[PDB]
């Protein structure tokens, strides 16, 4: 099995238009949640969202190129280019067939579908854009990243709702472990702030209807009432260890475990007691070849829904036993909102940086303790601590449980 290390990071999030800004805001407990501006909030019971601020795609590419990309693809291309530049990786003709791309999205180009369907209704099918299909489909983030980078290796796109970013990174990790690529540009992207996405997640009451941006996203709080929707992309460069060392790459950490399970229960409701999530964490722990007590910090899925936070806490207790009260847990969705398909990507970046910088980001907004959510959620303030192992969960709608384990890099 090959060892796989993290050599580059790239991100766009409601906390900043690069990794450094996003991470610095996360470690200082800054909220990225504000009033909805992308759509007319009057039409929905949800009133807040976590949007990108001050993002001008034309700062990264020509207007003609950006006009042929839905926002989810624009975020993926920008974050992937940022990650490859951070990695100082030169994708030459010689290495191109060994550099792959595995970036997922939960929804793909929903904004493009909506605008093009309105054109179909008013102008007819003969006025639908020739670019409609490639712009909408979720695999276009990987497709456009591959063209932008000249990456000709293993190529895919995972679509698993909230688990998308975590599954994509895990799948890319497995490609490198088995020797099928030397480098993988991987993660998740999402631009879900659209009319249908707000209508859909309001119709099934998943979104918080709390109009106060100061308290809307409050994972583990007794008064939590649903998630706050966010947007962005989190992309990392995974690389085979010997390949990284030979080119003098900087190494942030090592990816060592990946677990994937299904609840086989319900289309949207998480399984009772978090049994599926517990099994995914146990599979990742076994994959890493460690004891559960070796985990220092869990970057929780922690979406601020009643059932997720309760069941994820139960799953942590099942897996860790007495150690559940010794490790630190935090939900960075308290600050970023739920980035859906990009959540696992941004959270893998925060998990990797927590190890590299020795800082645990906090869960903000816990004002009322919930007796069912009684672990150490690192409330309010970041904690400076040397970390050896970090576990990140994505317990997605539809029963998709995905877990990654990261380790401090040791020669």
Residues that bind Cl ion (CB under 5 A): 205, 226
Q: Which of 157, 323, 325, 338 is catalytic?
A: 338
Tally of CB atoms within 10 A around 20: 12
Residue 394 tokens, joined: 């994505």
DSSP 246-277: HTT----EEEEEEEEEE--S-SSSPPGGGHHH
If binding is defined by CB under 5 A, does position 299 make contact with K ion? yes
The values of phi and psi at residue 88, to 5°, are 55, 40
Q: How far is CA 107 from CA 102, 216, 314, 336, in A?
A: 16, 23, 29, 18
* 299 binding partner (options K ion, Cl ion, a copy of itself, none; Cβ < 5 to 8 Å by kind): K ion
Among 55, 65, 66, 139, binds a copy of itself (CB under 8 A): 139
Q: Toward Cl ion, which CB reaches closer, 205 or 214?
A: 205
Q: In angstroms, what is the minimal distance from the CB of 404 to a copy of itself?
A: 14
Among 54, 62, 267, 411, binds a copy of itself (CB under 8 A): 267
Residue 322 tokens, joined: 């007495």
Residues 104-123 that bind a copy of itself (CB under 8 A): 106-108, 113-114, 116-118, 120-121
C-alpha dihedral over 160, 2, 178, 137, to 10 degrees? 30
Q: Which of 157, 243, 301, 400 is catalytic?
A: 301
DSSP 104-125: E-SS-SHHHHHHHHHHHHHH-G
If binding is defined by CB under 5 A, does position 347 make contact with K ion? yes
Among 16, 109, 134, 344, binds a copy of itself (CB under 8 A): 134
Q: In angstroms, what is the minimal distance from the CB of 16 to a copy of itself?
A: 28
Q: What is the DSSP letter of 47?
A: -
If binding is defined by CB under 8 A, does position 248 make contact with a copy of itself? no
* 265 binding partner (options Cl ion, a copy of itself, K ion, none; Cβ < 5 to 8 Å by kind): a copy of itself
Q: Toward K ion, which CB reaches closer, 15 or 181?
A: 15
If binding is defined by CB under 8 A, does position 74 make contact with a copy of itself? no
Name which of 224, 252, 223 is nearest 338 in CA terms. 224
Q: In angstroms, what is the minimal distance from the CB of 144 to Cl ion?
A: 24
Q: Toward a copy of itself, which CB reaches closer, 8 or 109?
A: 109
For the chain, the C-alpha Rg in angstroms (whole number) is: 20
Q: In angstroms, what is the minimal distance from the CB of 353 to a copy of itself?
A: 27
Name which of 358, 76, 99, 113 is nearest 232 in CA terms. 76
If binding is defined by CB under 5 A, does position 226 make contact with K ion? yes
Known catalytic membership, residue 162: yes
> Between 46 and 65, how does the x/- string for binding to a copy of itself read (CB under 8 A)?
--------------------
Cβ(187)–Cβ(345) below 8 Å: yes
> Between 181 and 220, how does the x/- string for binding to a copy of itself read (CB under 8 A)?
--------------xxxxxxxxxxx---------------
If binding is defined by CB under 5 A, does position 392 make contact with K ion? yes
Q: At what angle do helices 306-320 and 275-288 cross, to 10 degrees?
A: 40
Task: List all residues 6 or more positions away from 355 whose beta carbon is below 8 Å from its beta carbon.
Answer: 252, 253, 387, 388, 390, 406, 407, 408
Q: Toward a copy of itself, which CB reaches closer, 5 or 101?
A: 101
Q: Closest residue to K ion, Cβ-based?
A: 226
If binding is defined by CB under 8 A, does position 276 make contact with a copy of itself? yes
Rounded distance between C-alpha atoms, residue 171 and residue 166, angstroms: 9
Q: Which of 162, 243, 373, 400 is catalytic?
A: 162
Using CB under 5 A, list all residues that contact K ion.
Answer: 205, 225-226, 299, 347, 392-393
Instruction: Supply the residues annotated as catalytic.
Output: 162, 301, 338
């Amino acid at each position: 099995k090959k060892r796989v290390v993290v050599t580059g990071l790239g991100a766009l999030s409601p906390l900043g238009n690069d990794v450094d800004t996003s991470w610095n805001n996360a470690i200082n407990g800054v909220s990225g949640i504000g009033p909805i501006t992308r759509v007319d909030a009057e039409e929905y019971p949800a009133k807040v969202a976590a949007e990108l601020k001050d993002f001008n795609v034309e700062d990264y590419m020509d207007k003609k190129e950006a006009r042929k990309m839905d926002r989810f693809t624009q975020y993926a291309v920008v974050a992937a280019k940022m990650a490859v530049e951070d990695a100082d990786l030169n994708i030459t003709d010689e290495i191109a067939p060994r550099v792959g791309v595995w970036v997922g999205s939960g929804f793909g180009g929903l904004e493009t579908l909506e605008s093009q369907f309105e054109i179909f209704l008013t102008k007819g099918p003969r006025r639908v854009s020739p670019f409609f299909v490639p712009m909408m489909i979720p695999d276009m983030a990987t497709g456009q990243i591959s063209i932008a980078l000249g990456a000709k290796g293993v190529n895919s796109c995972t679509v698993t709702a909230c688990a998308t970013g975590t599954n994509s990174i895990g799948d890319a990790f497995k490609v490198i472990q088995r020797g099928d690529a030397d480098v993988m540009v991987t993660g998740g992207t999402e631009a879900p702030l659209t009319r249908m996405s707000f209508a859909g997640f309001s119709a099934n009451k998943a979104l918080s209807t709390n109009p106060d941006p100061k308290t809307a996203s409050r994972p583990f709080d007794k008064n939590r009432d649903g998630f706050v929707m966010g947007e962005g992309a989190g992309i990392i460069v995974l690389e085979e260890l010997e390949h990284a060392l030979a080119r003098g790459a900087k190494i942030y950490g090592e990816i060592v475990g990946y677990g994937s399970t299904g609840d086989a229960y319900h289309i949207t409701a998480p399984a009772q007691d978090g049994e599926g999530g517990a099994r995914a964490m146990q599979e990742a722990i076994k994959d890493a070849g460690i004891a559960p007590e070796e985990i220092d910090y869990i970057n929780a899925h922690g979406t601020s829904t009643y059932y997720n936070d309760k069941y994820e806490t139960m799953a942590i207790k099942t897996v860790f036993g007495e150690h559940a009260h010794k490790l630190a847990v935090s939900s960075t969705k308290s600050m970023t909102g739920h980035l859906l398909g990009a959540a696992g990507g941004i959270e893998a970046i925060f998990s990797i940086l927590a190890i590299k910088e020795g800082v645990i980001p906090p869960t903000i907004n816990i004002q009322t303790p919930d007796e069912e959510c009684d672990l150490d959620y690192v409330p309010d303030e970041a904690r400076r601590q040397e970390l050896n192992y970090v576990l990140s969960n994505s317990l997605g709608f539809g029963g998709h449980n995905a877990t990654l384990i990261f380790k401090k890099y040791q020669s």
